[PDB]
Design a protein around this ligand. Structure first.
Ligand SMILES: *[C@@H]1O[C@H](CO)[C@@H](O)[C@H](O)[C@H]1NC(C)=O
Ligand SMILES: *[C@@H]1O[C@H](CO)[C@@H](O)[C@H](O)[C@H]1NC(C)=O
Lengths: 197, 266
């Protein structure tokens, strides 16, 4: 197994007005296996970002999602990537982010930009699903199974964005739906979990 | 795709990745009637299938650059310079900030810009399997431009289109259109039109579009115009993606370079 280093070139500064949604791209280096843990640094190691319903880090693509930018977000951001199987971490050149203040931010409707795909699982496996929306105000994320009850042990984590189903049974397969919403509008996304037992 | 109107690789730079965008045959242009050549030998426009209702699998897709409708019916159109038959397959839209006084359109008439322009793109179904292939191969293309003015009452012939535009507000969203009659999206009279040789109005700016621009506008209401500015778009710059309302998604006007613009006679 392995994990190359991030490129040397600098990541150009970004100026974005408060209220807008943005995504900071991790752009992880070549690697194997693909069981990485993603984190983001603020300005320098080992100062890690605060995560909450407004700032989300995807464990599939490593991107940092910020529902709506706030002045307090000012800082430089680096993607910190760890491969547990080889006890190794590499992080990237920093994206300097410079919020542009606004006296009244523009409302944005919840828009889902992290969309889980169909998943196939063996009976017994754990399944994890991610959903997240840009939006101003910060959108609320809700989960449900389409026209069926959720598996009884399913857990919802990371400020609403992550649905985990444990020790998945055949009965758990079906179409799951993510709903995102703020007062300005809503969005939803659906896909299927298949269980092969 | 990988460009933008204003921003990274803005419309003035397109030529760097897409050379054809710099050719002397680019659209859009301004058209003044009295500078056109009245051509009474123009063949009358002929629309086949356009009065029939849309098929159920007709999707509208928010591409982040426009909202694009991929037609399914066997729509056909002939007329203008020749009676060559083309197949209509794609509709796109260009707008500004969605106000009556606003600009937004790409083409202009007598120097006037309109709040919204719809464009119907066509190809030769006999030389190509699709419009995309026709583009890739620099086949003869044909585009009809319909310009809009804000009226008072909602234009019901556009209800299905507008609801569609709403339903793909979110970036990348796709949705099936309710039934609509394509020919009813055109101006009440289509006899008066201009025709000139141009190009696609965004990369790769393919140089082979016969443009038909209609002289009579179509009317829609304010609330109708408004949904276009509720469309969201995500665009990459460097290592970041930025979300914005999609606005002013029109190309700046190009120079005619001695191209001739024909005008139909009525
Ligand atoms: C972020 O990076 C820039 C260099 O581009 C530096 O000038 C600035 O001080 C950094 N900010 C912090 C809080 O370290
Ligand atoms: C599923 O997740 C649980 C934690 O709740 C963990 O104990 C278990 O090892 C996981 N199942 C497998 C086979 O990894």
């Amino acid at each position: 197994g392995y994990l190359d280093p991030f490129p040397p070139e600098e990541r150009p500064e970004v100026r974005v007005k408060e209220g807008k949604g943005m995504v900071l791209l991790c752009d992880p280096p070549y690697h194997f296996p693909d069981d990485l843990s993603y984190r983001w640094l603020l300005n320098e190691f080992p100062v890690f970002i605060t995560m909450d319903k407004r700032r989300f880090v995807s464990q599939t693509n490593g991107n940092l999602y910020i529902a709506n930018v706030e002045a307090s977000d000012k800082g430089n951001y680096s993607c910190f990537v760890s491969s547990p199987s080889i006890t190794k971490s590499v992080f990237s050149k920093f994206i300097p982010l410079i919020p542009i203040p606004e006296r009244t931010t523009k409302p944005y409707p919840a828009d889902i930009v992290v969309q889980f795909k169909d998943v196939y699982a063996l009976m017994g496996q754990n399944v994890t699903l991610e959903c997240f929306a840009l939006g101003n105000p910060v959108p609320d994320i809700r989960w449900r199974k389409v026209l069926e009850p959720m598996p009884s042990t399913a857990e919802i984590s990371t400020s609403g964005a992550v649905l985990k189903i444990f020790n998945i049974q055949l009965e758990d397969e079906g179409i799951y739906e993510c709903e995102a919403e703020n007062i300005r509008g809503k969005d939803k996304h659906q896909a299927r979990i298949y269980v092969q037992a | 795709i990988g460009w933008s109107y204003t921003g990274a690789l803005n419309q003035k730079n397109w030529g760097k990745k897409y050379p054809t965008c710099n050719s002397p045959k680019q659209s859009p242009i301004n058209i003044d009637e009295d500078l056109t050549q009245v051509n009474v030998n123009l063949k009358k426009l002929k629309f086949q299938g356009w009065d029939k209702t849309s098929l159920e699998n007709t999707f509208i897709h928010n591409t982040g650059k426009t909202v694009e409708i991929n037609l399914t019916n066997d729509y056909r159109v002939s007329g203008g310079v020749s009676e060559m038959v083309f197949k209509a397959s794609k509709i796109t839209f260009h707008w500004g900030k969605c106000n009556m006084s606003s600009d937004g359109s790409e083409h202009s008439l007598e120097g006037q810009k309109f709040p919204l322009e719809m464009q119907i793109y066509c190809f030769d179904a006999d030389r190509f399997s699709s419009f995309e292939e026709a583009v890739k191969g620099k086949g003869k293309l044909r585009a009809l431009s319909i310009l809009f003015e804000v009226g008072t009452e909602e234009n019901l012939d556009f209800k299905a289109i507008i609801d569609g535009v709403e339903s793909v507000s979110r970036f990348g969203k796709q949705a099936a259109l309710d039934p609509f009659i394509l020919l009813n999206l055109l101006p009440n009279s289509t006899d008066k039109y201009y025709i000139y040789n141009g190009s696609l109005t965004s990369p790769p700016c393919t140089d082979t579009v016969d443009w038909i621009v209609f002289k009579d506008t179509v009317s829609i209401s304010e609330s109708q115009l408004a949904v276009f500015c509720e469309v969201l778009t995500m665009q990459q710059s460097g290592y970041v993606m930025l979300m914005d309302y999609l606005q002013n998604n029109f190309r700046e006007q190009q120079y005619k370079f001695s191209r001739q613009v024909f005008s139909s006679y009525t």
